[PDB]
Amino acid sequence: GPVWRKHYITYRINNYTPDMNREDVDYAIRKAFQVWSNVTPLKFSKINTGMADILVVFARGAHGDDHAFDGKGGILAHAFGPGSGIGGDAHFDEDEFWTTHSGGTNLFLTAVHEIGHSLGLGHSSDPKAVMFPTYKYVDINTFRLSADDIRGIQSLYG
């Protein structure tokens, strides 16, 4: 599928979930990007104005793309593959309760997965992979991509 054809990728946090401290949203997203820049040539930078490649949005229900959220549970987030406009963008369902920890839905872990999509990955069938469809909390402080994820992203970049 589509991939970014440049190494410097920008993201912008469109709006912040009230579920978390602002700085914790910033950090979770930053760290999630780092997971992927760790294993590719990509460089991610947060911008605070203008058009980013990857717009990070918190929204609930119907939110202006064709892909409505479903309230608490079920779909946690979704993201568009590389492309102009909505391409790359990552949307997080505000009806989830986002956290820094194992309570609610961990934003960092979810963002790692979604950013995978923003970079052009699809889902893995391996339950060990962050790109497995199903959210499962794993210790975020010890988090590592599965070999499956690394193989996936290194099939696209590098």
Annotated binding site for Ca(2+): 19, 53, 70-71, 73, 75, 85, 87, 89, 93-94, 96
From 91, 94, 106, 119, residue interacting with Zn ion (rule: CB under 5 A): 91
Can you tell me which residue has the tokens 């962050």? 130
Instruction: Give the three-state DSSP class for 40.
Output: coil
Strands (E), 70-122: 77-79, 90-93, 98-99, 105-106
Q: Which does 149 bind (CB under 5 to 8 A by kind): Ca ion, Zn ion, none?
A: none
Q: Specify the stretch interacting with Ca ion by CB under 5 A; choose among 7-15, 37-45, 86-94, 131-139.
A: 86-94
- Alpha helix locations (H) across the chain? 22-37, 107-118, 147-154
Nearer to Ca ion, 77 or 145 (CB): 77
From 1, 65, 127, 147, residue interacting with Zn ion (rule: CB under 5 A): 65
**Amino acid found at 137:** Y
